[PDB]
Design a protein around this nucleic acid. Structure first.
Ligand SMILES: Nc1ccn([C@@H]2O[C@H](COP(=O)(O)OP(=O)(O)OP(=O)(O)O)[C@@H](O)[C@H]2O)c(=O)n1
Length: 367
RNA sequence: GGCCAGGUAGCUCAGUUGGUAGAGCACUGGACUGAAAAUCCAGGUGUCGGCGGUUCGAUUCCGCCCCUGGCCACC
């Protein structure tokens, strides 16, 4: 219908950006980005009006948002910078060749992929490539983004792009960049499943030293990240119904050796979840003594009392120890699973004394 | 869209080792009155957002959502 209204309005609209990428990558998304030649706002308003749904105009930006079913649509008037602007100009201001492409929704040429910079080739050759040498200088944030993409799509930075990247970091542009955009980029990063590879790229191009103050790379942290990867794999395999956000764990491992001040400040800037802050504050201090108590554990009920109050994250951090692994697992798929019939419980009940009694019964069952 | 609070009576507000809920003014009924108010005895002041899950038991632990306010990312 978009091509039809665009025909009636004598306009030209296109699907543009990552949305194209994902389409060519077979990944179906519900957020579609349109670049319109001519007014995008009226097109959005008309389309929303025909489907009888609400519309959200942004005249100053020149964009409009509307939601149809589970489809989220964003229309944006073609602009040369971040006289009417051609599509090509809207695309050439973009970052990488794979994000620079477009697909025509106009009825005559419909289905056509419009690629000026050969983003199809770089998509085919698995290459992350900037459009212009100044691309990282324009937006230093891209430095992260590239790596992130290279992490997710398992692509490789071209020689050019790699050099320009390293140069961009060497100029310390990462410090000059807005803190918020960078922090948000990292937040996007840790949500990836391939985020570990992205961390490998972060170590390789040493961006974390620039973004995080006081952060340095060592081997213990890396091995901890791979062990955490294995634990995450197993937990997300058998316990997958219990899954939580995994990337934050890696983030905790990274900042583990950092000072509590810089750690708290970083987690503050990252707008981390409460359980992340709790698991961190618990890791920095009480974790050691907890481990030492887990070493002194003999009966199963002590392990119960020491574990059950803790979150899942803390337990996953406890699986990092070779000696504690099988113990944690035993607590997981066996120890905490048990119940009691009717008559027995009815005899148990005959305040808090009921709880203490039930605890005595559980420690009577375990040991 | 991310996060942080806030969600407790009609309104304005506190509450952690899960274990049988509170204040100031409106609400009913009666004692009191020619009627009413005040006042006394008292007692509703509540599935402590909604829905699942864990637990013998959840305002509390967790997950998914609703509402309001504030920091932002809003290519
Ligand atoms: N500094 C920047 C930032 C963004 N862009 C372009 O603007 C778009 C921003 O949308 P985004 O969601 O970041 O791209 P996606 O590929 O959709 O990423 P994702 O799907 O992971 O959101 C990108 O496609 C990119 O081509 C750019 O050219 N330069």
């Amino acid at each position: 219908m978009v091509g039809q209204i665009a025909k009636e309005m004598g306009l030209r609209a296109y699907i543009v950006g990552g949305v194209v990428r994902d389409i060519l990558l077979g990944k179906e998304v519900w957020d579609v980005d349109f670049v319109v030649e001519g007014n995008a706002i009226e097109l959005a308003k008309e389309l929303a009006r025909r489907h009888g749904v609400n519309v959200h105009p942004f005249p100053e930006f020149g964009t409009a948002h509307l939601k149809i079913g589970k489809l989220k649509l964003e229309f944006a008037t073609a602009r040369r910078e971040t006289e009417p602007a051609s599509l090509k100009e809207d695309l050439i201001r973009r970052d990488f060749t794979i994000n620079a492409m477009a697909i025509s929704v106009n009825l005559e040429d419909y289905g056509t992929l419009i690629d000026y910079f050969g983003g199809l080739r770089d998509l085919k050759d698995k290459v992350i490539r900037v459009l212009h040498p100044v691309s990282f200088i324009e937006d230093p944030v891209r430095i992260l983004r590239a790596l992130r993409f290279a992490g997710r799509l398992n692509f490789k930075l071209s020689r050019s792009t790699e050099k320009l990247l390293k140069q961009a970091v060497n100029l310390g542009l990462l410090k000059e960049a807005p803190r918020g955009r960078l922090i948000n980029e990292i937040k996007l990063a840790l949500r990836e499943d391939r985020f570990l590879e992205i961390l490998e790229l972060y170590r390789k191009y040493r961006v974390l030293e620039e973004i995080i103050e006081g952060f340095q790379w060592n081997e213990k942290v890396l091995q901890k990240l791979y062990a955490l990867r294995k634990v995450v794999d197993w937990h997300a395999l058998e316990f997958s119904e219990e899954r939580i956000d995994y990337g934050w764990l890696y983030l905790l491992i990274l900042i583990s050796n950092l000072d509590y001040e810089r750690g708290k400040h970083f987690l503050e800037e990252m707008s981390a979840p409460s359980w992340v802050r709790e698991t961190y504050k618990f890791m920095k201090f009480k974790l050691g003594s907890l481990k030492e108590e887990l070493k002194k554990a003999k009966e199963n009920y002590e392990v119960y009392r020491l574990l059950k109050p803790l979150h899942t994250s803390v337990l996953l951090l406890l699986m990092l120890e070779e000696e504690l692994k099988e113990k944690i697992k035993l607590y997981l798929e066996k120890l905490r699973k048990v119940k009691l019939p009717k008559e027995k419980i009815e005899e148990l009940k005959k305040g808090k004394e009921l709880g203490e009694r039930i605890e005595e019964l559980k420690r009577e069952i375990m040991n």
